[PDB]
């Protein structure tokens, strides 16, 4: 009810049976008494380390800007970042170093985390943008169909004259006023809305959510997420060994499979993907935080038989990382391959965001060593990207004797001479007196 309404207190007795239970009801001894659940802050989810333990070196105290390591401690073989780190606006300006676990639940080494990804301080407005987009997008628009006056299936004829009978003037009573009738403007799937998300906002919100998980200490870096066998018993055994609570009421785990440090992959590991199909709350997501630029070909009602909501026709796939899933699942697990892919796909965006007086310095400090120009040995890439690059290298040979050489286009663009034919009203190329231009067909 409303606090100010009299109904809020119109009941004055009978709420409690004055006789207490003999099982758990107790008394308040005094301030020295520690009451369960009591806490000075309004915690709607009053959890502690025992309920939902955090996987991080330190409990996230306000004294620490983040629970993870701030320096590369010498006890472990610290690994740097795949790409150089530049602190953009919104980054924590602090060094993020986290320990990497193995399938045995024991740390093997430590890894640097990019501030632009796990160091972008969260903001509630952006997180809420992401959450609202996901909530609106994850509805079953096909089930939002309702009948209409023209669909009620009643005779199209005045049921009786205006004044002759003695009842209200009603003709063709298909209207909402009647129980069998419909609505003038009912809800239809093609009338509903599917919001259009921007790649920039989506990436920013996803990185803010990742940083929020990192701050809360729910983040865990794992070397590999492979199973001995593709069954579910092996997956449950791995969860038990790693102390992952995938029960429906345990906290949940989100998995960015990706790949290992040496062999990042965009495709889920076969065995783990097969074995991760378990009833309990446990979600598997792609190793990407970006999203394909959403579009809407039917931006106007040009296709009248479009049985889909107005708006973007390319909504984010369900398995994509999102704020809703990140909040619902307690722990987050990210593989070295996932980190590699995230850094690889966000490096260009970070550099473009950087201002110009730092952009110009980038190459000076060596953050723009392009493998294509031979400045450096080619960088590490996922299995699929490396295969595609090898295919390109192998196929580059055939573009040698043809004028349409993509690698060396317009080779004779300088030695040729350009002439203007007034009679033809055109401009043409000539090499050694031979017309090289092409009279475009029409």
């Amino acid at each position: 009810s409303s606090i100010f309404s009299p109904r809020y207190d119109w009941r004055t007795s009978g709420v409690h049976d004055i006789a207490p239970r003999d099982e758990g009801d107790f008394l308040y001894q005094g301030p020295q008494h520690v009451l369960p659940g009591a806490h000075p802050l309004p915690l709607h989810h009053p959890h502690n380390t025992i309920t939902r333990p955090v996987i991080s070196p330190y409990i996230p105290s306000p004294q620490r800007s983040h629970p993870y390591f701030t320096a590369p401690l010498p006890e472990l073989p610290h690994f740097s970042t795949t790409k150089p780190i530049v602190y953009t606006y919104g980054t924590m300006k602090e060094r993020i170093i986290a320990p990497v676990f193995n399938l045995k639940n024991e740390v093997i080494y430590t890894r640097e985390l990019d501030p632009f990804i796990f160091g972008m301080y969260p903001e509630v407005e952006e997180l809420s943008k992401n959450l609202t987009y996901w909530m609106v997008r994850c509805q079953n628009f096909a089930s939002k169909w309702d009948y209409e006056t023209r669909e009620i299936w009643r005779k199209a004829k005045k049921n009786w004259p205006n004044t002759g009978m003695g009842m209200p003037r009603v003709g063709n009573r298909k209207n909402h006023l009647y129980t069998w009738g419909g609505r003038t403007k009912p809800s239809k799937p093609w009338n509903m809305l599917m919001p259009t998300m921007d790649v920039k906002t989506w990436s920013k919100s996803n990185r803010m959510m990742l940083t929020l998980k990192m701050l809360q200490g729910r983040l865990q870096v794992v070397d590999r997420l492979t199973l001995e066998e593709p069954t579910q018993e092996c997956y449950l055994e791995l969860c038990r060994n790693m102390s992952w609570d995938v029960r429906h009421t345990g906290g949940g785990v989100l998995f960015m499979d990706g790949g290992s440090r040496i062999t990042p992959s965009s495709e889920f590991d076969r065995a783990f993907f097969f074995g991760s199909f378990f009833n309990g709350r446990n979600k598997i997501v792609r190793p990407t935080v970006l999203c394909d630029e959403q579009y809407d070909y039917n931006k106007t009602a040009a296709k009248q038989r479009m049985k889909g909501p107005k708006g973007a026709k390319n909504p984010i796939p369900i398995n994509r990382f999102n704020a809703y899933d990140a909040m619902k699942h307690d722990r987050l697990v990210i593989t070295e391959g996932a980190l590699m892919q995230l850094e690889d796909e966000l490096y260009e965006h970070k550099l473009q965001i950087l201002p110009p007086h730092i952009r110009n310095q980038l190459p000076e400090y060596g953050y723009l060593d392009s493998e294509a120009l031979g400045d450096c040995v080619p960088s590490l890439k996922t299995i699929q990207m490396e295969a595609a690059a090898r295919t390109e290298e192998a196929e580059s040979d055939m573009y040698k004797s043809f004028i349409d050489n993509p690698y060396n286009p317009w080779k004779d663009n300088m030695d040729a001479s350009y002439a203007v034919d007034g009679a033809d009203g055109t401009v043409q190329k000539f090499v050694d007196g031979k017309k090289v231009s092409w009279s475009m067909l029409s």
Partner: protein, 341 residues
């Protein structure tokens, strides 16, 4: 319309009028340790006399202030029991009056007795002890004991830093700007400001004590002492402001939604309280005796049942049909193996 207030007007109730409970020093600490590191009486009339004495103090009529404080102290001594807050406070005022008049020895004796009474008492007021330390420092400075006055000021500073809450003053005054619903006019409510110097007298007392300590250091010629005391004063003001800070909600005019006032004015935690008792540093005690779901290793500490048996994982598809159920026969066995031991 416009109001002239030519006739009596009842002051409007506002959240800034909350009766703030004064900070009190803990019962397990000793002011002496820190240093060494009812009969009927017309209290209304004696309060009139005390107010008149305060006015004389402000007006510079120190002899008259001392004369009034003499009667007030006599009355309080007769009325209240020994080692009482009112008695020590009136003795502080009397010591200040003596110091201003010129009876430095009398002022020193009175403030020393005040400190003795504070040590003897239990849970003394933080503001009261800070004011007593300030008065002792001023008296020592007047006597010429600059070093001891500075020591007293520093002691007051450390006492307030270690036993003062810097956000409690504006706990209920921090979300007031959110009450405002109009932007074109009556927008002073969206920027309503309450001065910490007025809503936290301990802060003002310590600020004055640190200013006097800085002046004494400058007079002596010391540099490190002045730097540290000024920096501590700056940090104190920074703490107060930080506790006062907040973002802006709705900016432009809002029509209706007057029931949002309940949300706007609440026990909103202050920044200092939030940082102190964050959910992780100040963990929540969760007794599984009164809870159903418990961690994997402590599955046996759940709310006891008369005689309970596990049926399945509650798979909603079980209701559907033979094939749907057949597609989940081993789920319960696998879950049991997962939760084994």
């Amino acid at each position: 319309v416009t109001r002239l207030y030519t006739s009596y007007y009842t002051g409007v109730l506002y959240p800034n009028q909350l009766v703030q409970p004064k900070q009190r020093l803990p019962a397990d600490v000793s002011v002496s340790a820190i240093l060494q590191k009812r009969p009927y009486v017309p209290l209304g009339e004696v309060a009139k006399l005390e107010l008149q004495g305060d006015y004389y103090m402000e007006g510079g009529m120190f002899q008259e202030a001392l004369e009034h404080y003499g009667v007030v102290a006599k009355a309080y001594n007769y009325a209240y029991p020994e080692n009482h807050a009112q008695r020590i406070g009136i003795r502080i005022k009397l010591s200040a009056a003596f110091r201003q008049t010129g009876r430095l020895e009398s002022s020193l004796a009175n403030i020393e007795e005040v400190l003795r009474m504070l040590d003897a008492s239990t849970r003394p007021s933080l503001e009261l002890i800070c004011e007593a330390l300030l008065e002792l420092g001023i008296t020592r400075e007047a006597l010429g004991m600059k070093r001891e006055a500075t020591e007293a000021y520093e002691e007051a500073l450390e006492v307030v830093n270690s036993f003062h809450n810097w956000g409690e003053s504006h706990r209920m005054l921090r979300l007031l700007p959110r009450l405002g619903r109009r932007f074109n006019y009556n927008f002073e409510e969206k920027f309503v400001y309450f001065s910490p110097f007025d809503y936290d007298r301990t802060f003002a007392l310590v600020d004055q004590c640190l200013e006097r300590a800085e002046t004494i250091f400058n007079e002596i010629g010391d540099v490190e002492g002045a730097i540290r005391v000024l920096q501590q004063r700056k940090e104190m003001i920074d703490k107060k402001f930080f506790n006062m800070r907040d973002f802006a909600g709705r900016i432009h005019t809002m029509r209706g939604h007057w029931k949002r006032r309940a949300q706007h004015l609440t026990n909103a935690p202050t920044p200092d309280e939030l940082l102190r008792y964050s959910p992780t540093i100040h963990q929540v005690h969760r007794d599984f005796k009164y809870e159903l779901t418990a961690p994997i290793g402590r599955e046996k500490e759940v709310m006891p049942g008369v005689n309970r048996l596990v049926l399945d994982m509650g798979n909603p598809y079980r209701r559907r049909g033979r094939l749907s159920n057949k597609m989940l026969k081993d789920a319960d066995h696998k879950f049991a193996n997962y939760v084994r031991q």
